[PDB]
Design an enzyme around this catalytic site. Structure first.
Site, PDB file in Angstrom:
ATOM      1  CB  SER A  99      -0.790   0.082   1.194  1.00 65.75           C
ATOM      2  OG  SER A  99      -0.056   0.048   2.373  1.00 65.75           O
TER       3      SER A  99
ATOM      4  N   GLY B 257       3.653  -0.560   4.352  1.00 64.78           N
ATOM      5  CA  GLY B 257       3.628  -0.549   2.863  1.00 64.78           C
ATOM      6  C   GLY B 257       4.539   0.632   2.140  1.00 64.78           C
TER       7      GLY B 257
ATOM      8  CB  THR C 282      -6.574   2.866   8.211  1.00 67.07           C
ATOM      9  OG1 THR C 282      -5.833   2.344   7.499  1.00 67.07           O
ATOM     10  CG2 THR C 282      -7.671   1.637   8.503  1.00 67.07           C
TER      11      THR C 282
ATOM     12  CD  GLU D  34       7.236  -9.281 -26.146  1.00 64.85           C
ATOM     13  OE1 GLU D  34       6.900 -10.382 -25.738  1.00 64.85           O
ATOM     14  OE2 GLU D  34       6.972  -9.170 -27.340  1.00 64.85           O
TER      15      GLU D  34
HETATM   16  N1  LIG Z   1      -6.872  -2.807  -1.403  1.00 65.66           N
HETATM   17  C1  LIG Z   1      -6.630  -3.205  -0.031  1.00 65.66           C
HETATM   18  N2  LIG Z   1      -6.293  -1.920   0.696  1.00 65.66           N
HETATM   19  C2  LIG Z   1      -5.882  -2.259   1.699  1.00 65.66           C
HETATM   20  C3  LIG Z   1      -6.040  -3.463   2.419  1.00 65.66           C
HETATM   21  N3  LIG Z   1      -5.346  -3.403   3.744  1.00 65.66           N
HETATM   22  C4  LIG Z   1      -4.987  -2.155   3.893  1.00 65.66           C
HETATM   23  N4  LIG Z   1      -5.243  -1.340   2.885  1.00 65.66           N
HETATM   24  C5  LIG Z   1      -4.732  -0.114   2.377  1.00 65.66           C
HETATM   25  O1  LIG Z   1      -3.704   0.182   2.824  1.00 65.66           O
HETATM   26  C6  LIG Z   1      -3.550   1.638   3.671  1.00 65.66           C
HETATM   27  C7  LIG Z   1      -3.255   1.187   4.919  1.00 65.66           C
HETATM   28  O2  LIG Z   1      -2.013   0.658   5.046  1.00 65.66           O
HETATM   29  P1  LIG Z   1      -1.665  -0.675   5.445  1.00 65.66           P
HETATM   30  O3  LIG Z   1      -1.069  -1.667   4.621  1.00 65.66           O
HETATM   31  O4  LIG Z   1      -3.143  -1.405   6.244  1.00 65.66           O
HETATM   32  O5  LIG Z   1      -0.445  -0.536   6.885  1.00 65.66           O
HETATM   33  P2  LIG Z   1       0.809  -1.313   6.937  1.00 65.66           P
HETATM   34  O6  LIG Z   1       1.607  -1.599   5.581  1.00 65.66           O
HETATM   35  O7  LIG Z   1       0.619  -2.702   7.681  1.00 65.66           O
HETATM   36  O8  LIG Z   1       1.701  -0.322   7.760  1.00 65.66           O
HETATM   37  P3  LIG Z   1       1.531  -0.367   9.447  1.00 65.66           P
HETATM   38  O9  LIG Z   1       0.356  -1.022   9.803  1.00 65.66           O
HETATM   39  O10 LIG Z   1       1.665   1.375   9.357  1.00 65.66           O
HETATM   40  O11 LIG Z   1       2.994  -0.788   9.963  1.00 65.66           O
HETATM   41  C8  LIG Z   1      -5.093   2.088   3.291  1.00 65.66           C
HETATM   42  O12 LIG Z   1      -5.055   2.938   2.236  1.00 65.66           O
HETATM   43  C9  LIG Z   1      -5.916   0.907   3.106  1.00 65.66           C
HETATM   44  O13 LIG Z   1      -7.133   1.238   2.638  1.00 65.66           O
HETATM   45  C10 LIG Z   1      -6.151  -4.750   1.714  1.00 65.66           C
HETATM   46  O14 LIG Z   1      -6.521  -5.712   2.066  1.00 65.66           O
HETATM   47  N5  LIG Z   1      -6.717  -4.384   0.547  1.00 65.66           N
END
Ligand SMILES: Nc1nc2c(ncn2[C@@H]2O[C@H](COP(=O)(O)OP(=O)(O)OP(=O)(O)O)[C@@H](O)[C@H]2O)c(=O)[nH]1
Ligand SMILES: Nc1nc2c(ncn2[C@@H]2O[C@H](COP(=O)(O)OP(=O)(O)O)[C@@H](O)[C@H]2O)c(=O)[nH]1
Ligand SMILES: [Mg+2]
Lengths: 432, 431, 48
Positions: B132, B138, B171, B246
């Site tokens: 993310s 992320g 979040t 490609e």
């Molecule tokens: N499509 C999708 N988006 C997700 C999901 N889980 C979280 N997000 C999105 O990713 C963002 C939140 O980041 P996270 O991935 O939950 O957090 P993290 O990477 O675990 O990082 P920390 O918890 O801060 O250590 C927001 O925009 C959420 O809407 C999922 O399963 N699917």
């Protein structure tokens, strides 16, 4: 002058090359096991030009199959005549060229080149009198284009006195598998101008146009295009593989066809035009076959022969026909179309007749022209190249391989000089 | 032979990974224990002495919660424990904690596991990185990992599947900061990145699948379908395929302009039964409708530089060419002047597979269009503006500074984004 | 004299092609070495 060593490089090169071998094997009465089952002594008279005779009654293509990618090789082995090829003659890498001339010419290709030369040396040292080499490849890809031209240069280094011949397939937006084809083609044309003795300019633009417009195939496939390629390749090689007086070897063909060293790009023509399925057909007389020489519709290079002048022409008639009728019809065409032949090269049209017609046809005609109109094909590539190069689009794919911008500028300039050279002789007069 | 290593970072990356690997197993007939009763699937799954098929993947999170669900779940036997890596403390939605503070402790361990996977490869093509933009892991951990991968792997291909943030499912208030910081740091390390806007996915689930309040489970199943379409060409041998190299050659004209727009069709609800079967023309027409896009933006206001159409199932080349020809008669699709060849088409024989008990209907044919359009710059602009609103007041900046980040890093990241927006503008101008 | 003349005239132009072709080998090695040196230095950068 006897043996020709054949090399097939890249996807296109191997596809067209495999079709060439199944077409000529059928004409020479050779089955997929290598055994001669024909019923004419003409089929075997010059069999040694393309085939080595192995222990017993078997004939093996003097062919080397090259690719940086393994998949194409597997497809060839699986094919109809796949078993005819020498197992040791398949030379393939594992890391492809990714439609990048730089990978084929400098990186991945350079790594495989020595393994290929080892196989070409084995075939060459077996020869009583090696004429030279025949390479089938595309100019739009990475292996056929980049590695193919690298092979030409490496072979030229070891065999500088042998004839270097190619069947080079020109890319087209009409049947394109990559956006970078103008770059790959220009970089390759630069190499061919300098390193080959004769090049058959096989244009995918022209093959697509023939399939769509003439054969009425709404969606042409590579199979449809390759049927025209194999018919042309069979026609242009007729003189080399059957007993004849004219252009019987690669050097005599070059001596008759090439007046100036750089002007060695041929425009092939074929009549009648047929589709894979079309096993009909009821047609084609001698005046009909002859008329298609000036017919742009029958050209394998997307150029109008009436937009230029013929420096030299070789015309091959196949099937059972009158040699008297052929001579009359051929003289008529030169007299009627005087303006499309240079006056400063006397008796520049040479005709040959072979009794053996190609498969499916009772009568056929193949044309090999050295025309100033071929500049139309090179102009098309240069303009496509410049549209991209002006903005340095996709250049990172090449510079990322260690290439410099200057090589691009040089290749383009050399190709434009070639165009300018064709124009010069188009405008030249016998004011003498 | 031609292996691809998949890396799943943070909650979003791990959860999308769960959906992707579940779908791959259904497509290749692999059971949740790795057993299976083509041969191209070997690019994504290695094989053990017991005939078990193991994903060529690493799952990383700084908190254990999400991955703990994988190691207790249905596919606990699919992955070996060493490829499921978790820390103790999360990055708390802070890029600085993910990249520096917390990330620096687990980085060496993660790279050691990736090295062990790479050692099992004979022809490693490169990496697929799922994460993310919004979370601290992320964003922060991904950019740290991307930098380290460039060092250890020379010029080995790295492709991203990035979750662009949406407020309906956001979040953290600081997601625009984390998004800009990760994009700046990762830009020079990524070869091609496929953004997935959570709002676009949220709206498709609501509109096409009739889900009142879409959950991550709903979003990920749909995302998994697009990822599977992009990776089917690597995992199967069809009539028309495209390898790691490609994709980049056809879609990426300049190093920085590496963000293709994905459009998928058809998305049909598991109810009805009359809403099918869609023709090749119908699904192709659907690719040019902004409602089927993976990122919210307007292509009619932008210019195309490359269009790749990836068909799957009962599709014939003649059908495709007929469909492209009618679309070409709709003048409205403008390309840049330095681009001639617009359409690269791929056909993969297998019809789209759906998860049993899922929201998606089974279709005979589907298509994923990957287009490099200057219209994608609109997504960067929205993010950059939200960054600017908060940054003008230095709101929340203290959280990053406290972790050892400097304010200069924020200015640098934002200037790089301004240059990226300028690049998309320059690319659309005619010569 | 008017034959070993041809023999020697033959050779200059072969030696010449081999030069024009040793020069083509030069470039390749240069552009492949330059294709590493640069990647070698991007990481020289990246680490520090
Ligand atoms: N499509 C999708 N988006 C997700 C999901 N889980 C979280 N997000 C999105 O990713 C963002 C939140 O980041 P996270 O991935 O939950 O957090 P993290 O990477 O675990 O990082 P920390 O918890 O801060 O250590 C927001 O925009 C959420 O809407 C999922 O399963 N699917
Ligand atoms: N006529 C013909 N052209 C082909 C064929 N396969 C590919 N091409 C053309 O060759 C170019 C692409 O090069 P290709 O030979 O596939 O790449 P390589 O494997 O790296 O040499 C393009 O101009 C294609 O249109 C084929 O079987 N026949
Ligand atoms: Mg988290």
């Amino acid at each position: 002058m006897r043996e020709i060593v054949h090399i097939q490089a890249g996807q296109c090169g191997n596809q067209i090359g495999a079709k060439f071998w199944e077409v000529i094997s059928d004409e020479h009465g050779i089955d997929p096991t290598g055994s001669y089952h024909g019923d004419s002594d003409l089929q075997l008279e010059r069999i040694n030009v393309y085939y080595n005779e192995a222990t017993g009654n078997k004939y093996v293509p003097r062919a080397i199959l090259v690719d940086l990618e393994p998949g194409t090789m597997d497809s060839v082995r699986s094919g109809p005549f796949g078993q005819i090829f020498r197992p040791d003659n398949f030379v393939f890498g594992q890391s492809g060229a990714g439609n990048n001339w730089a990978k084929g010419h400098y990186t991945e290709g350079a790594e495989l080149v020595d393994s290929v030369l080892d196989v070409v040396r084995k075939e060459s040292e077996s020869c009583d009198c090696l004429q030279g080499f025949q390479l089938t490849h595309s100019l739009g890809g990475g292996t056929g284009s980049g590695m193919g031209t690298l092979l030409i240069s490496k072979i030229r280094e070891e065999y500088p006195d042998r004839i270097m011949n190619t069947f080079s397939v020109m890319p087209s937006p009409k049947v394109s598998d990559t956006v970078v084809e103008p770059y790959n083609a220009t970089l390759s044309v630069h190499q061919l101008v300098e390193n080959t003795d004769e090049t058959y300019s096989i244009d995918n633009e022209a093959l697509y146009d023939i399939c769509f417009r003439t054969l009425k195939l709404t969606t042409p496939t590579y199979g449809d295009l390759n049927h025209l390629v194999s018919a042309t390749m069979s026609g242009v090689t007729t003189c080399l593989r059957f007993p004849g007086q004219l252009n019987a070897d690669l050097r005599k063909l070059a001596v008759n066809m090439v007046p100036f060293p750089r002007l060695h790009f041929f425009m092939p023509g074929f009549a009648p035009l047929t589709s894979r399925g079309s096993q009909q057909y009821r047609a084609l007389t001698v005046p009909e076959l002859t008329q298609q020489m000036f017919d742009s519709k029958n050209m394998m290079a997307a150029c109008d022969p009436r937009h230029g002048r013929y420096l030299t022409v070789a015309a091959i008639f196949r099937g059972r026909m009158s040699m008297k009728e052929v001579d009359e019809q051929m003289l008529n065409v030169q007299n009627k179309n005087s303006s499309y032949f240079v006056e400063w090269i006397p008796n520049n049209v040479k005709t040959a007749v072979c009794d053996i017609p190609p498969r499916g046809l009772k009568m056929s005609a193949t044309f090999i022209g050295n025309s100033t109109a071929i500049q139309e094909l090179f102009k098309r590539i240069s303009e496509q190249f410049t549209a991209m190069f002006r903005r340095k689009a996709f250049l990172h794919w090449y510079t990322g391989e260690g290439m410099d911008e200057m090589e691009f500028t040089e290749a383009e300039s050399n190709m434009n000089d070639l165009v300018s050279e064709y124009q010069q002789y188009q405008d030249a007069t016998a004011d003498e | 032979m031609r292996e691809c290593i998949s890396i799943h970072v943070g909650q979003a990356g791990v959860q999308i990974g769960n959906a992707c690997w579940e779908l791959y197993c259904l497509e290749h007939g692999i059971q949740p224990d790795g057993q299976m009763p083509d041969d191209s699937f070997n690019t994504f799954f290695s094989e053990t002495g017991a005939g078990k098929h193991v994903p060529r993947a690493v799952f990383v999170d700084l908190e254990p919660t999400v991955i703990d669900e994988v190691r207790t779940g249905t596919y606990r036997q699919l992955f070996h424990p060493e490829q499921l890596i978790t820390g103790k403390e999360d990055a708390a939605n802070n890029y600085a904690r993910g990249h520096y503070t917390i990330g620096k402790e687990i980085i060496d361990l993660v790279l050691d596991r990736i090295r062990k996977l790479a050692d099992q490869c004979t022809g490693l093509q490169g990496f697929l990185v799922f994460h993310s933009f919004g979370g601290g892991t992320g964003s922060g951990f991904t950019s740290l990992l991307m930098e380290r991968l460039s060092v250890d792997y020379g010029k080995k291909s790295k492709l991203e599947f990035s979750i662009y943030p949406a407020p309906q499912v956001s979040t953290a208030v600081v997601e625009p900061y984390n998004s800009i910081l990760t994009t700046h740091t990762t830009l020079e390390h990524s070869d091609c990145a496929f953004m997935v806007d959570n709002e676009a996915i949220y709206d498709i689930c609501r509109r096409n699948l009739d889900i009142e309040r879409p959950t991550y489970t709903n979003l990920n199943r749909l995302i998994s379908q697009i990822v599977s379409s992009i990776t089917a060409s690597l995992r199967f041998d069809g009539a028309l395929n495209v390898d790691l190299t490609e994709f980049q050659t056809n879609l990426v004209p300049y190093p920085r302009i590496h963000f293709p727009l994905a459009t998928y069709a058809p998305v049909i609800s598991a109810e009805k039964a009359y809403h099918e079967q869609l023709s090749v023309a119908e699904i192709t027409n659907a690719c040019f409708e902004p409602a089927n896009q993976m990122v919210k933006c307007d292509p009619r206001h932008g210019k195309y530089m490359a269009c790749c159409l990836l068909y799957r199932g009962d599709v014939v080349p003649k059908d495709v060419n007929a469909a492209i020809a009618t679309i070409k008669t709709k003048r409205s699709i403008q390309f840049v002047d330095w681009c001639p060849t617009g359409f690269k088409v791929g056909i993969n024989y297998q019809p789209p597979t759906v998860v049993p008990g899922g929201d998606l209907a089974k279709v005979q044919r589907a298509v994923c269009m990957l287009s490099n359009t200057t219209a994608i710059a609109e997504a960067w602009a929205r993010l950059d503006h939200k960054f600017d609103l908060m940054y003008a007041k230095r709101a929340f900046v203290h959280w990053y500074v406290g972790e050892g980040m400097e304010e200069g890093e924020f200015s640098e990241a934002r200037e790089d984004m301004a240059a990226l927006e300028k690049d998309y503008e320059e690319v659309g101008v005619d010569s | 004299k008017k034959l070993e003349a041809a023999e020697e005239r033959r050779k200059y132009q072969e030696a010449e092609l081999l030069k024009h072709l040793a020069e083509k080998r030069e470039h390749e090695r240069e552009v492949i070495q330059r294709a590493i040196e640069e990647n070698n230095n991007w990481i020289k950068m990246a680490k520090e």
